[PDB]
Design a protein around this ligand. Structure first.
Ligand SMILES: [Mg+2]
Ligand SMILES: [Mg+2]
Ligand SMILES: [Mg+2]
Length: 210
DNA sequence: CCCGGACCTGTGACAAATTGCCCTCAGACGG
DNA sequence: GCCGTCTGAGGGCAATTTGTCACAGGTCCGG
């Protein structure tokens, strides 16, 4: 199945994308890498890849596509837009998109890689952002360990403002995404909290391969 | 002493958003 | 050349998930 690879600069970039948008982003990165920035997505291919009907596939592409407008990417800083021209459909079931050519060197560079089947059942986009970052530290055999800072998680992933209250951080982001990964990917994940005084400052993730 | 106050935790409520589903009907193709 | 079938571009839904905040209940500090 398709092997996604990406610069660590992208894994650790600041952005806010939906699941549907991240799914499309994986194929653009695949298309570009197998080579101006103009990519294409076929409705019938997307539906087969992610096990959707053609109808719901069409709905997912169209709304994702119109929600890219105004979205920006930050590399730690420097900010760029994803698209420099609106999308358009020359043929029925076919969309043409114009990716910002200045993003190309950030896609292909110190790199991250995973097969698309590892993530295609994840639902929560924050859970995607997390499985990508853990992969950045994975070993050939399949294990790894990493300490991520809470302020850095909140910015890079662009968690919503109320998750600056730690019990909400735990309840609606950390626990759910650890469960999805354990339930929807071939990885088995655990964690522990690092504290300093009364404040919890980092999260230490351990994982192995099933 | 014990207070009011500034931290921290977890849970119950509700609002806002997203999920996979359902229905309609016209376009492109081929037999 | 007409029509039958597969597509996909639209319109919606109720059931769940995600985002937000009041309130109960722990600690330590300092005047
Ligand atoms: Mg959808
Ligand atoms: Mg009680
Ligand atoms: Mg009290």
């Amino acid at each position: 199945s398709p092997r996604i690879v990406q610069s660590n600069d992208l894994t650790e970039a600041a952005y806010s994308l939906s699941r549907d948008q991240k799914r499309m982003l994986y194929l653009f990165v695949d298309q570009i890498r197998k080579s101006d920035g103009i990519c294409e997505i076929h409705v019938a291919k997307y539906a087969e890849i992610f096990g959707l009907t053609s109808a719901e596939a069409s709905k997912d592409i169209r709304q994702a596509l119109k929600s890219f407008a105004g979205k920006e990417v930050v590399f730690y800083y420097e900010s760029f837009p994803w698209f420099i021209k609106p999308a358009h459909s020359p043929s029925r079931g076919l969309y043409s998109v114009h990716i910002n050519p200045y993003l190309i060197p950030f896609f292909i560079g110190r790199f991250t890689q995973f097969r698309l089947s590892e993530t295609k059942e994840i639902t929560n986009p924050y859970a995607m952002r997390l499985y990508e970052s853990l992969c950045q530290y994975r070993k050939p055999d399949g294990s790894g360990i990493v300490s991520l800072k809470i302020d850095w998680i909140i910015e890079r992933y662009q968690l919503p403002q109320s998750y600056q209250r730690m019990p909400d951080f735990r309840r609606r982001f950390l626990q759910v995404c650890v469960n999805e990964i354990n339930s929807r990917t071939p990885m088995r994940l655990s964690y522990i909290e690092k504290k300093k005084g009364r404040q919890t400052t980092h999260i230490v993730f351990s994982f192995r391969d099933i």
